[PDB]
Swiss-Prot record, chains A, B:
Organism, scientific name: Escherichia coli (strain K12)
Residues of the full protein shown: 394 to 604 of 1024
Effect on the protein of changing H148 to E/F/N: Poorly reactive with galactosyl substrates. Less stable to heat than wild-type
Positions contributing to substrate binding: E69, E145, Y146, A147, H148
Record protein name field: Beta-galactosidase
Gene name per UniProt: lacZ
Induction line: By allolactose.
Binding site for Mg(2+) 2: N205
Active site: E69 (proton donor), E145 (nucleophile)
Binding of Mg(2+) 1, residues: E24, H26, E69
Record family assignment: Belongs to the glycosyl hydrolase 2 family.
Annotated Na(+) binding sites: F209
Assembly and binders: Homotetramer.
Length: 211, 211
């Protein structure tokens, strides 16, 4: 969840917002170790319920999100249903555990490609055109993250837009991402320079991956 | 419906067969002028019912078809349902009126392209990949006709097969078609030559479109 003023601004300037619970357990092995564990349900629920309680009157928020990169656990399913009872007015999405689980109203993969399948075991990233028509699948597909803009990037961006325009159920997505997470440091002459991971003696770090 | 031996041979050699009622009204304006007319329902029904009564014991027949290029009329709906009641063991298909009407269990377009849309009014031919994922569509897609093999043709055939293999609900199709409809004539030396439309003093005619 963001600074309160963000929603006010999006309400007034006009931006659709996906409001996302502060839950990410990416580093767990496997990724759902905590989110499938009933002992973590209370800490998890507070992160979801207190978000909804805070932001549910903002017109800009059109979609609720259960968080990011925490696999798919039973806690997700419980919290999905909690939102659906409490606030039927907005769809709930969540990418974890394969982007098309029972905890999401929207097929919301990250970095699924337009035409090329990436058949990873358990959590494949189908071509978004193919994903739509898998046997029994009926939901819309909006990419929660796509077109990783790291450095000299965004090659093949037009391919996504052509597909979005041709397919009714391909309804767009969210680029990753808006702003480089570089921080200012100063050299000996007091001159500013953009720093990334490692430049603060931080180790282990992931270098330029923050940009 | 074919010569009775054809089915016996498909039974024993192993080919899947689409058995098709002898109904085509292509030259009507509009195409369904007769098939939407209840006065022509008796004649159409005999063409459908007497086929089922003849061929329903052949294992090689796996799909019934209501006929060919006759638009979509109410008579098709009624006869679709007749077959569904009398023989539940086989799907019913029909391409008329846009290939996805209420008279077909199978989206069965003719010459629908792989990636390219052809948005004709009333009866569009969507890209087959797009067609599957149209809002609310669930049915399998098998082209009743594709890859028109007229003269030096079959350019782009590989494109179909790549897509058939990638998309579960793209379950293939039926090439148009098996054998040139040329006839033998004889020159003044008595040597045979391949003749087509117009070569018998037939007028008007559609020339080589029979091959
Ligand atoms: Na779209
Ligand atoms: Na990053
Ligand atoms: Na297929
Ligand atoms: Na022809």
């Amino acid at each position: 969840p963001n600074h309160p003023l963000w929603y006010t601004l999006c309400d007034r300037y006009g931006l659709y917002v996906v409001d996302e619970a502060n839950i990410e357990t990416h580093g767990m092995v496997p990724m759902n170790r905590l989110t499938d564990d009933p002992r973590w349900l209370p800490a998890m629920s507070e992160r979801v319920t207190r978000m909804v309680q805070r932001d549910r009157n903002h017109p800009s928020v059109i979609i609720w999100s259960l968080g990011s990169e925490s696999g798919h656990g039973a806690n997700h399913d419980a919290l999905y249903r909690w939102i659906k009872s409490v606030d039927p007015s907005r769809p709930v999405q969540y990418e974890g555990g394969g982007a098309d689980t029972t905890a999401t109203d929207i097929i919301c993969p990250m970095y699924a490609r337009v035409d090329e399948d990436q058949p990873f075991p358990a959590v494949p990233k189908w071509s978004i055109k193919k994903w739509l028509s898998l046997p029994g699948e009926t939901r819309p597909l909006i990419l929660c993250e796509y077109a990783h803009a790291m450095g000299n990037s965004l090659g093949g961006f037009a391919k996504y837009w052509q597909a979005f325009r041709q397919y009714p159920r391909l309804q767009g997505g969210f680029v990753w991402d808006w702003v480089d997470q570089s921080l200012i440091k100063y050299d000996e002459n007091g001159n500013p320079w953009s720093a990334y991971g490692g430049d603060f003696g931080d180790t282990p770090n992931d270098r330029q991956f923050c940009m």
